[PDB]
Amino acid sequence: KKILLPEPSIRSVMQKYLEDRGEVTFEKIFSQKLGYLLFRDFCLNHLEEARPLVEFYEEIKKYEKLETEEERVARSREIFDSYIMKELLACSHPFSKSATEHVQGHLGKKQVPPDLFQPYIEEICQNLRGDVFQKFIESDKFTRFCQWKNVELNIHLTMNDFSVHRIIGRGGFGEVYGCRKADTGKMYAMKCLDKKRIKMKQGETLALNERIMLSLVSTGDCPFIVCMSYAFHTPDKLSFILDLMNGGDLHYHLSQHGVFSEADMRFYAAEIILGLEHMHNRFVVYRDLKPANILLDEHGHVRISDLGLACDFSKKKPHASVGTHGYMAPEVLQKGVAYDSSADWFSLGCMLFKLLRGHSPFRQHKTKDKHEIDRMTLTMAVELPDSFSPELRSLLEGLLQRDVNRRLGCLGRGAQEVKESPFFRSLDWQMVFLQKYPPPLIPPREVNATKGIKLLDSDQELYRNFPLTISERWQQEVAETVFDTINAETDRLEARKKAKNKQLGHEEDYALGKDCIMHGYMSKMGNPFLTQWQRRYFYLFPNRLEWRGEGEAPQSLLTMEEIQSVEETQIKERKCLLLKIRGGKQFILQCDSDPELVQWKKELRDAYREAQQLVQRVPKMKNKP
Amino acid sequence: SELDQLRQEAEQLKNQIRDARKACADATLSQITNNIDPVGRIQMRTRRTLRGHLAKIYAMHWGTDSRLLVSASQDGKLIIWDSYTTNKVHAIPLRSSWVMTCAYAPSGNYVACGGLDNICSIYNLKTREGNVRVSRELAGHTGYLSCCRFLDDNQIVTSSGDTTCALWDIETGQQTTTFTGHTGDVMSLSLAPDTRLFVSGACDASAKLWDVREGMCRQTFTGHESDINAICFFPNGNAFATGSDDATCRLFDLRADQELMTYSHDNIICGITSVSFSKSGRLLLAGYDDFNCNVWDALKADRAGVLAGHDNRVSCLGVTDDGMAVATGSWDSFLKIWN
Amino acid sequence: ASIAQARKLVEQLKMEANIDRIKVSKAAADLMAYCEAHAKEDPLLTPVPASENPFREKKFFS
Numbered sequence A: 001k002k003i004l005l006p007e008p009s010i011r012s013v014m015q016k017y018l019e020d021r022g023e024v025t026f027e028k029i030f031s032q033k034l035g036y037l038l039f040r041d042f043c044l045n046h047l048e049e050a051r052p053l054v055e056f057y058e059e060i061k062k063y064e065k066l067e068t069e070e071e072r073v074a075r076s077r078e079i080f081d082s083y084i085m086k087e088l089l090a091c092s093h094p095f096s097k098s099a100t101e102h103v104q105g106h107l108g109k110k111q112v113p114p115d116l117f118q119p120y121i122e123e124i125c126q127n128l129r130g131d132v133f134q135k136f137i138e139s140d141k142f143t144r145f146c147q148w149k150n151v152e153l154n155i156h157l158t159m160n161d162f163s164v165h166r167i168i169g170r171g172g173f174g175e176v177y178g179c180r181k182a183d184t185g186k187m188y189a190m191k192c193l194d195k196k197r198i199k200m201k202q203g204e205t206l207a208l209n210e211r212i213m214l215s216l217v218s219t220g221d222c223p224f225i226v227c228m229s230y231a232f233h234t235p236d237k238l239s240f241i242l243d244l245m246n247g248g249d250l251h252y253h254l255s256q257h258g259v260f261s262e263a264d265m266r267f268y269a270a271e272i273i274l275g276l277e278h279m280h281n282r283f284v285v286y287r288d289l290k291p292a293n294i295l296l297d298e299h300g301h302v303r304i305s306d307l308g309l310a311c312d313f314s315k316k317k318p319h320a321s322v323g324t325h326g327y328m329a330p331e332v333l334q335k336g337v338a339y340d341s342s343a344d345w346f347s348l349g350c351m352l353f354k355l356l357r358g359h360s361p362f363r364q365h366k367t368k369d370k371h372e373i374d375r376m377t378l379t380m381a382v383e384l385p386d387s388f389s390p391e392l393r394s395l396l397e398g399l400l401q402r403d404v405n406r407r408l409g410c411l412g413r414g415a416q417e418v419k420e421s422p423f424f425r426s427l428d429w430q431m432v433f434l435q436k437y438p439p440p441l442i443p444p445r446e447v448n449a450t451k452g453i454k455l456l457d458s459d460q461e462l463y464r465n466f467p468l469t470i471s472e473r474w475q476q477e478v479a480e481t482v483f484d485t486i487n488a489e490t491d492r493l494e495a496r497k498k499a500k501n502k503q504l505g506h507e508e509d510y511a512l513g514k515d516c517i518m519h520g521y522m523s524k525m526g527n528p529f530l531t532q533w534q535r536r537y538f539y540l541f542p543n544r545l546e547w548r549g550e551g552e553a554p555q556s557l558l559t560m561e562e563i564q565s566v567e568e569t570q571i572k573e574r575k576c577l578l579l580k581i582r583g584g585k586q587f588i589l590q591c592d593s594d595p596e597l598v599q600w601k602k603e604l605r606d607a608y609r610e611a612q613q614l615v616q617r618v619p620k621m622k623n624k625p
Numbered sequence B: 001s002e003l004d005q006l007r008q009e010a011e012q013l014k015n016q017i018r019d020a021r022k023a024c025a026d027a028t029l030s031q032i033t034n035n036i037d038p039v040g041r042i043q044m045r046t047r048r049t050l051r052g053h054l055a056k057i058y059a060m061h062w063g064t065d066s067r068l069l070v071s072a073s074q075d076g077k078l079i080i081w082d083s084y085t086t087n088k089v090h091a092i093p094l095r096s097s098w099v100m101t102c103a104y105a106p107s108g109n110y111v112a113c114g115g116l117d118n119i120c121s122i123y124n125l126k127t128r129e130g131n132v133r134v135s136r137e138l139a140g141h142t143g144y145l146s147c148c149r150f151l152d153d154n155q156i157v158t159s160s161g162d163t164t165c166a167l168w169d170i171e172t173g174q175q176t177t178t179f180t181g182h183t184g185d186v187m188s189l190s191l192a193p194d195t196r197l198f199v200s201g202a203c204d205a206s207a208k209l210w211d212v213r214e215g216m217c218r219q220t221f222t223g224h225e226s227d228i229n230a231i232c233f234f235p236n237g238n239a240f241a242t243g244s245d246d247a248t249c250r251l252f253d254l255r256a257d258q259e260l261m262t263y264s265h266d267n268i269i270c271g272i273t274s275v276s277f278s279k280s281g282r283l284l285l286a287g288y289d290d291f292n293c294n295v296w297d298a299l300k301a302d303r304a305g306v307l308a309g310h311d312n313r314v315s316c317l318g319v320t321d322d323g324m325a326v327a328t329g330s331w332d333s334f335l336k337i338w339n
Numbered sequence C: 001a002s003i004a005q006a007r008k009l010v011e012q013l014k015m016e017a018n019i020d021r022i023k024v025s026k027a028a029a030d031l032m033a034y035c036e037a038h039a040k041e042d043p044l045l046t047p048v049p050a051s052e053n054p055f056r057e058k059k060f061f062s
């Protein structure tokens, strides 16, 4: 069930593995949640030079989050005095001439941005980079980082990793379920699309795109968009693991509440704007903006959901005509007519009207005509009801402007423009973002809101790039759940095995002071017909591969001269390595994780190749006739 | 031109030497020894089989005590064996895996090995607290180490794929004297019993005599059609035998400054890896790539006996100072003992 | 290529050329004489009893 960490011995392989990908740098490590937490546990606890440099970093971070000025002025005195002025009097400040002065100027003028300390951030980082980083790599905190990294990199999800509950949505090509990831106990949503019910509609593109689109957006944690942490499939379904929203959609709430007041709509608008800002910062127009695609959490806060029809305008701009009818901007509907973010402003405009009045604005007399809802959008200013305030009007005016020349949001600074709408004068957008505003609707506690077909080789190939894990989400999940409590158990377990070896005597590792390239645990195969796989500790040297079991020295080996090929092979569907040996013989090895396999291959190939070009040059060593 | 003229007259000196040599070829050694009785068949059998190395053995050497003997293997270790019981006095893991050669010092207090690390590492067997440190790492060659022999505990001679050999001072670490002349990878050496002279053999298929103290080459022996892999002095120090890729061994006398005898058959096509002389000089022992060691009559050039329990190449061999025994070492990972 | 290095070759060839050589018959006879002189103290050449052989039936050492 729970997450088990690989043994410390795993460090030999992951370190080379990361090193190959440049990922053993201060930059790359410091900026990962678990890397961060391990670095700091090191500096603060086990290294005296480093403690202050990080406390200082941290205090600044708490200072960038201070809400006011009156909160600010205060803390930035203590921060100065404590982490600088103390030092200055003892000559010992390990920072620039400029930096130091740049802060003290903002103090005597009492003009204190949230960035004051930014010249220092850079320099704390220079001060930590390089040399201090080096000792951390040598420390068993980096060994611990390698253990968590190994688990990360070996994720292969299946339905079984999930404890799956009630359905909380039906629609498009499948269903959504509440669920719990067993590892960590995290509640998530699970959106399950039936591959068949897809082919039937040649809908494959859309299914894929959602995945592509989700990945551009699911970084940063946006509170106002439903985001993804894993994707995986089985032969029949695609699965997305998603942010849980079990509160129902507006389309449904609307139908039960009836229409919302300006006040209540202002709340949703604001969260929705902010969601749009996020996506628009990453060049993604959402396009299917509407009550049914806005979701409520348990408390009534909202998220933009379902990015199937959403698309990227980074390199080239769409001109195509997609959306739900009655919420599409002019430039959209018109084919041969390109566009960007703009549609979402219009659609917002459209949508908000709807929350106030029970219908799309261009859907009077409950018509269905699809061609004429389009007409009303082209040359036509919409008449805004007598009951709407002056400020609501100017907003909708701004948002529904036939032309993009003169629509609100499309004049240079996105989002911001609409936030300055005096419809929102009353609001503070930092406080919107922190979800501090009480929502007007609290979902009560549940919501409720054919086959002859086959599946070829070349169907599943469409889905070959589908699975995926988002490092940022996984680390976050772990960091909030089991990381402290596992590091703990692990710590204790390793110190049993080690302190017990202080009795036994397995006490002077065999790799040290030689030319070993790598070592670790693998399972070689004895007799196939007995599922005999004996697990050994292997050491790789530049001209042989030694191995052993518990207690002994190595009794056995294989030389690099003897190895002809190294290949990947399938056995009872786990991946092994196949070393073919000169006597027409074979030698199979199973690794415990992807990266371990990936690495043992690169190194075995490198080593046999070099050793053979080497021996070839040495007259005493080569084979002659 | 002067560059022409010095090549011209090296060519002319070459002739002076060939001629001077033929002027002394008044008889052959075979003629001379036609009379004496043959050796009969030499029949040795495996006494000991030494088991431990996990890969090929590339080299071995005996201690003067005629009992302990050191070996080096592609398993990146040396083992120091007691032949009498088969016990392992020591087992040394090396710092570089690419070892090729080893040696036991006269005293039996130090050993030495090297390889593609390009260093001769001296291992003090007998430490302050019964351990085995590396006492020294003699660095300076610019190519693989191919052979080494102690003169005594404070000096040593090496041979290298950089085509030179060298005299070192162990305490200081210094390359005292170097020995240039060979135009190809030097592959083996042997110290004359009096330690004032050694010979080297090389991939140029010449072999050379050198004076230690003077750092010079006195004499150069051509004749082989191919790489000389192995070389050993006749016990009186007046001659030496070589073994080569041309499937022949040869005996060269120093004072007559030329070859006296080739050892061979049409039935033997592979190269020779190694050579030693029985205690009297009378037998010449050679290890071959066809797995067998051939034992030759040194004086009559006949082929007396064969040592043959080895499933791969015999890569090295040696005879004890007391003459009681012969050790053979193989690519099949074992040493055997023969007597 | 080098003039230094050709000068050097030749001086070496002079050392080699100006040695005192001896007759091969004398040389070879001197060798034959070595082999007889030590033929009796060479175990591989002559058959010794087990009780002088470290390796045959022997159990007992240091």
Ligand SMILES: CC1=C(C(=O)Nc2ccc3n[nH]cc3c2)[C@H](c2ccc(F)cc2)NC(=O)N1
Pocket (backbone or CB within 6 Å): A168, A169, A170, A171, A172, A173, A174, A175, A176, A189, A190, A191, A192, A193, A226, A242, A243, A244, A245, A246, A249, A292, A293, A294, A295, A305, A306
């Ligand atoms: C936005 C929308 C649906 C939807 O996406 N519902 C969701 C989506 C993600 C969720 N996370 N947590 C509860 C969720 C509920 C729901 C739906 C859509 C696609 C599906 F595959 C299943 C349900 N039906 C519908 O009309 N519109």
